[PDB]
Design a protein around this ligand. Structure first.
Ligand SMILES: C[C@H](CCC(=O)NCCC[N+](C)(C)CCCS(=O)(=O)[O-])[C@H]1CC[C@H]2[C@@H]3[C@H](O)C[C@@H]4C[C@H](O)CC[C@]4(C)[C@H]3C[C@H](O)[C@]12C
Ligand SMILES: C[C@H](CCC(=O)NCCC[N+](C)(C)CCCS(=O)(=O)[O-])[C@H]1CC[C@H]2[C@@H]3[C@H](O)C[C@@H]4C[C@H](O)CC[C@]4(C)[C@H]3C[C@H](O)[C@]12C
Ligand SMILES: C[C@H](CCC(=O)NCCC[N+](C)(C)CCCS(=O)(=O)[O-])[C@H]1CC[C@H]2[C@@H]3[C@H](O)C[C@@H]4C[C@H](O)CC[C@]4(C)[C@H]3C[C@H](O)[C@]12C
Ligand SMILES: C[C@H](CCC(=O)NCCC[N+](C)(C)CCCS(=O)(=O)[O-])[C@H]1CC[C@H]2[C@@H]3[C@H](O)C[C@@H]4C[C@H](O)CC[C@]4(C)[C@H]3C[C@H](O)[C@]12C
Lengths: 231, 120, 44
C-alpha cells in the first residue's frame, strides 16, 4: 504493498469525504488532517491512481440556501353588550384589531441543519427543564438540480398570564412539514383561519331586565416560506 | 480548531443547580480550503429577565446555529428576524359616556452577520 | 472487482434511495453525500 498519499480537498471539508473514500479504497485506511483539508489514504497504487477522478465527482462546490419564514396573524373582533333594565341602559361597543408579521431567516449549507431562535428561555416543571419559548425555525434543506427539499419546523410561541394550572401556560403556534420548493418561490407551508360569531339574549317573553350580548371574532394565520439558493 | 468567546454572566439554573453562561457568545469551528472557509457557527446573545412568572429565572434568548461557506473577506447574513406588531383597540358607545381607544405599532429587526478573514 | 461510481439524484433526496439501491446492488455499499445529493455505490 500500500502506498500512502495525501490529497487536497478544495470545495468540501475533507472530513465529510472519509466514508465515501473508505468505500473507494475498501477491498482505518483513510484519515483527515483537518487543518489543511487533506485526506491521507493508504491503498494499492492502482486504486490510488483512480482516486483523483473520484474526488472530482464527490468533492463539488456545495450550495447555500436562504430560507425565509413568514408568520402573519390578523385578528379582528367586535362586541355589543346592551342592557335595558326598566330606566338604566348600559351599552358597550368594543372593537379590536391586530397585525403581527414575523419574518425569521437563516442561511445554511445544503445538507446541514440550521436554526434560529429568538424569544425567552423559560423553566418548566417536569425537577425543572428549560425550554425556548418564542419564534424559532429549524431547517434541513437539500438542493438537488433548481429545487430544494426542506424539512421545516416553524414555532411561534409566547407566555400566558394564566395561572389556571400547575405551571406556566404558553401560547403555541407550530408547523412541521417537509415540502419541495423551487429556487425562489413562496409556498403556503400552512395556516389556520378562525371565525366565532357568538350571540346571546336574555329577555322577558314590575321590573323588566333585558340584556343582549354579541361577538364576532375573526382570525387568520399564514405561514409562508421562501428558499433561495445563494451559490 | 475550535474557538469560543463568551462575555456575559454565569447564572445558576435549577434542574440541584447547573451553572450556565448567559450573554454574548460565539463558538466557531472553521476550516479553510483553497480562498474559502467552511464555518460551523453558533452565535448566542442572551440576557436575564426580571420576570418572576415561573419556577426559576427567565432568560431573553437570541441564537443562530448553522454551517455556511464564506470567502476570504466576505460578510454573510447568517440569519435574522424582523417583526411588526400593529395592535389597535377601541371601546365606545354605539348619562355617562366613557370612550377609550388604545393603539400600538411595534417594529423590530435583528440581523446576524459574519465576516471571516484568513490571516496567513 | 467492484467499481465505485457516483450518481446524481435529481428529484428526491438521495438519502431515501439508499435502501432501494441497497437491494439493486445486493447479491455498506451505498452511501449518500447529502450536500450535493449524490449516491456513491460500490458493486460489479
Ligand atoms: C402583506 C403580505 C405581502 C407579501 C408580499 O408582498 N410578498 C411576499 C414576500 C414577502 N417578503 C418576505 C419578501 C417581504 C418582507 C419584508 S422585508 O422586511 O423582509 O423586506 C402578505 C401577507 C398575507 C399575504 C396573502 C395571504 O398569504 C393569502 C394568499 C396566499 C398566496 O400564496 C399568495 C396570495 C395571498 C393573497 C397573499 C398575498 C400577500 O403575499 C400577503 C398580503
Ligand atoms: C367570503 C367567504 C367566501 C365566506 C365562506 C365561508 C363564510 C363564513 C361561514 O359561512 C361561517 C360563518 C357563517 C355566519 O353565518 C356568517 C359568518 C361566517 C364566518 C362566514 C363569513 C364569510 O361569508 C365566509 C368566510
Ligand atoms: C450600520 C451597519 C454598517 C456596517 C458596515 O458599514 N459594514 C459592514 C462591516 C462592519 N464592521 C464590523 C467592519 C464595522 C464594525 C465597527 S468596528 O468597531 O469593528 O470597527 C449595518 C447594520 C445593518 C446593515 C444592513 C442590514 O444587514 C441589511 C442589508 C444586509 C446586506 O447583507 C447588506 C446591505 C444591508 C442594507 C446592510 C448594510 C449595512 O451593513 C448595515 C446598515
Ligand atoms: C415596505 C415593505 C416592502 C413592506 C412589505 C410588508 C409590509 C408590512 C406588512 O404588509 C404587514 C403590516 C401591514 C399593516 O397594515 C401595515 C404595517 C405592516 C407592518 C407592513 C409595513 C410595510 O409596508 C412592509 C414592511
Amino acid at each position: 504493498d500500500n502506498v500512502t498519499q495525501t490529497f487536497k480537498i478544495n470545495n468540501v471539508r475533507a472530513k465529510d469525504l472519509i466514508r465515501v473514500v473508505e468505500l473507494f479504497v475498501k477491498s482505518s485506511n483513510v484519515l483527515s488532517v483537518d487543518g489543511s483539508n487533506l485526506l491521507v489514504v493508504s491503498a494499492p497504487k492502482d486504486i490510488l491512481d483512480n482516486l483523483p477522478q473520484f474526488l472530482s465527482t464527490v468533492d463539488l462546490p456545495t450550495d447555500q440556501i436562504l430560507i425565509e419564514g413568514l408568520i402573519f396573524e390578523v385578528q379582528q373582533g367586535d362586541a355589543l353588550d346592551f342592557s335595558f333594565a326598566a330606566l338604566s341602559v348600559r351599552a358597550l361597543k368594543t372593537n379590536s384589531h391586530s397585525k403581527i408579521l414575523s419574518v425569521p431567516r437563516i442561511l445554511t449549507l445544503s445538507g446541514q441543519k440550521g436554526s434560529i431562535s429568538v424569544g425567552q428561555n423559560v423553566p418548566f416543571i417536569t425537577t425543572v427543564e428549560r425550554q425556548n419559548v418564542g419564534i424559532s425555525m429549524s431547517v434541513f434543506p437539500v438542493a438537488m438540480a433548481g429545487n430544494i427539499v426542506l424539512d421545516i419546523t416553524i414555532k411561534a410561541d409566547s407566555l400566558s398570564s394564566s395561572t389556571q394550572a400547575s405551571d406556566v401556560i404558553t401560547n403555541q403556534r407550530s408547523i412541521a412539514t417537509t415540502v419541495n420548493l423551487r429556487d425562489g418561490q413562496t409556498l403556503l407551508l400552512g395556516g389556520l383561519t378562525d371565525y366565532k360569531n357568538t350571540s346571546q339574549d336574555s329577555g322577558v317573553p314590575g321590573l323588566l331586565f333585558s340584556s343582549r350580548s354579541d361577538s364576532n371574532e375573526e382570525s387568520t394565520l399564514y405561514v409562508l416560506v421562501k428558499a433561495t439558493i445563494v451559490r
